Amino acid sequence: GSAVPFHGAHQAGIATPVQDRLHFAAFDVTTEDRAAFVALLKEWTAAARRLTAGHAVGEGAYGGLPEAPPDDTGEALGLKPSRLTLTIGFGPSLFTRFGLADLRPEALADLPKFPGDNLDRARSGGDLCVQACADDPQVAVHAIRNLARIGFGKVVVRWSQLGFGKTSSTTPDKQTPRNLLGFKDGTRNIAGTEKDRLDRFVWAAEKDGTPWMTGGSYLVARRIRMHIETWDRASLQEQEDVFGRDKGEGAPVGKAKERDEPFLKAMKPDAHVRLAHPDSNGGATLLRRGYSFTDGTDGLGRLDAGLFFLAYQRDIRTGFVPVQRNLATDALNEYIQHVGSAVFAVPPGVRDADDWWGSTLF
Amino acid sequence: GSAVPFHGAHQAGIATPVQDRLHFAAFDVTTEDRAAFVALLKEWTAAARRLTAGHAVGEGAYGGLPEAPPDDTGEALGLKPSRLTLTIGFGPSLFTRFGLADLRPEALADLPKFPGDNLDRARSGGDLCVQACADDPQVAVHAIRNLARIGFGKVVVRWSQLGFGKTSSTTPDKQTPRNLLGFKDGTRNIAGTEKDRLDRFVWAAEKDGTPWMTGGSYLVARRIRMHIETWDRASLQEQEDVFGRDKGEGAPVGKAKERDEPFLKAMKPDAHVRLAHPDSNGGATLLRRGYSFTDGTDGLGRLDAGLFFLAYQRDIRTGFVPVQRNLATDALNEYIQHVGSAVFAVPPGVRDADDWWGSTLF
Ligand code: HEM
Ligand code: HEM
């Protein structure tokens, strides 16, 4: 129920412990007025300060003038902060506006086409994103809804994704959640307490070449459908062979405990963990922070299910891209398909009550 | 509270405490063989006993023959029962199979077309339903997913709806939840503690005309989309006039506290509470047990959210039908649209370990 501090050198919602629920929204910018967009960013930052503390935006949800719409839509009244974090990011397409072309970070790289990609352009891309994570889904939806309302006429929601449950962990002292394939997901990630690994693999540094991004990160989002019917037909041995870990304990093959270190040579050459491991990718390491989703049925008699994959890294070119390239032969590919994609530059944190989202860029 | 007893004179999930999350699935039957369908009901009931106790179905999720698919898909391993209830219901279309046409209860009435209906046929109807309620959405999804898997070849999933109410870890039990219009939702309802009211308004009685339904109930499901962005542009006074209660406290107009009894005469004539109140409907009273939903963003950039309405009643003709008919002029109609509908006969409870879902019918 507690609040997560909004201010810091970094935005919350990255190294923060992973909350139960996600509402991810991608926005496109509809205004050409740089000043009006900067004003929006300040208004959004002010609202985010209220929302993450459990307060209503503006002058509140009721008690104002009867003839005016309330400033806050009111469905979070009486609710605790619920560890709400709000994380903003800027997509490549933003930098074609407002005279920003020369400020696009080199580390904000467009993703190549990958084998098997079946990307829906409507559920991909976006000028900017807001990742809302909280333990209460109503608190998360309330935040996105009120940011979008405040932004009416300056931004429109391009697409959004809800995650009903996490499939990641930044807290290895807590139980690792399972994805909808039934495997623990998050065992060998970067923990929020591992400051040295966050500096090396997650946070952008001044010497990296883009000063306004110092203290920020780069986000890759991949909407991944799972072929549940095919998976659920597979034998237990086939499933464990796909990953290189056993299903029950989640230990590396041959070992007894989840957090025992993998011995990669004991795994099949196309095992997911073997191909995605840093040792197999020149040391490339990611902070995974994804969530599960199900968006109804496929219309053909089956549940739809997937994983909304989110990875934070210091440089997309040295994080997601090499690892995903190495997954070209992944045995998992038989059971999944990437159907949505987006990359964002996540700016540094809001330092204090005078600062605002994107101040280092604008 | 950890688990909710599965066995009883009534199915759990109706009068039992309302859990934080919903996964509602409608199934269509694909087999013509009555014996095969009875076998499935027995297998499902065995699975449900395991699931509601927090155990895996069948021989488990791991540790079986390596060359065999696991009996349980495994994504609920390590989770608690989370107050899971599983409630099955039979739709009108089921009674066109297996020679059951003369056993369809008269109280399982087809709903008339209502003004403003915009029903998606693909998200309506269904031969069967399973209402999975729990505090952990992964527990509920795992239940539906495994029931669907066990039934593969005999049933398919027609449509599926995830929903949420309050988050109990952070929200007191005595506090009324708010719907996504920001108003308290549930103040004047039948509570599961009111045994006499349940006997009068909710449970089917032997003398009602269908003996196999004694101790059962009748369920109406309506997927009601809210026009969120239009609602949020309405003035505070307009919103309160729509309902006849104030937004902050939820008290009836002219009264001071949420639970003060309404003075209907002081509300506008087409106020929602005034039109839906039992005194306006010849005494008709419902057990409302619905959930909020938010499924994402639609093609126009609007929030796909609303109320997944669920009502239980002794007879659809004397519960939902008269009340919904009286909402023909509801001021709320400007802001909502009914887009899915289904009705189900919910059979009596599973009395003991040898009983099975549907045994009184088959
Ligand atoms: C539906 C899609 C996916 C599923 C079900 C899945 C599942 C898993 C599982 C079960 C593990 C072992 C437990 C763990 O350490 O977290 C794992 C590890 C990992 N995955 Fe995935 N994964 C998926 C997609 C991806 C993608 C797209 C990437 C990167 C492009 C990725 C990168 C990693 C990494 C880096 C590890 C840790 C390997 C290590 O250092 O030991 N995964 N994944
Ligand atoms: C999105 C759609 C709806 C919304 C937002 C909504 C909202 C509300 C609100 C705020 C209340 C007052 C608090 C309460 O007692 O729960 C209420 C009461 C009620 N509503 Fe609705 N409602 C909706 C649809 C319906 C429908 C479809 C029905 C029946 C067909 C219905 C029947 C009732 C009843 C019986 C009451 C209690 C009236 C009383 O006895 O005081 N509602 N509703």
Author numbering:
A (entry chain A), B (entry chain B): 55 to 416
Sentences from the paper on this structure:
Here, a high-throughput approach to determine room-temperature damage-free structures with excellent sample and time efficiency is demonstrated, allowing complexes to be characterized rapidly and without prohibitive sample requirements. We have applied this approach to crystals of two heme peroxidase enzymes: a multifunctional dehaloperoxidase from the marine annelid Amphitrite ornata and a dye-decolourizing peroxidase of industrial relevance from Streptomyces lividans (DtpAa). We also examine the challenging case of detecting nitrite binding to copper nitrite reductase from Achromobacter cycloclastes, where the ligand displaces a water molecule bound in the active site. Our results cover several different ligand-binding scenarios, such as coordinate-bond formation to a heme iron (imidazole) or copper (nitrite) and noncoordinate ligand binding in a pocket (DHP ligands), with the latter being highly relevant to the binding of ligands to pharmacologically important proteins such as cytochromes P450.
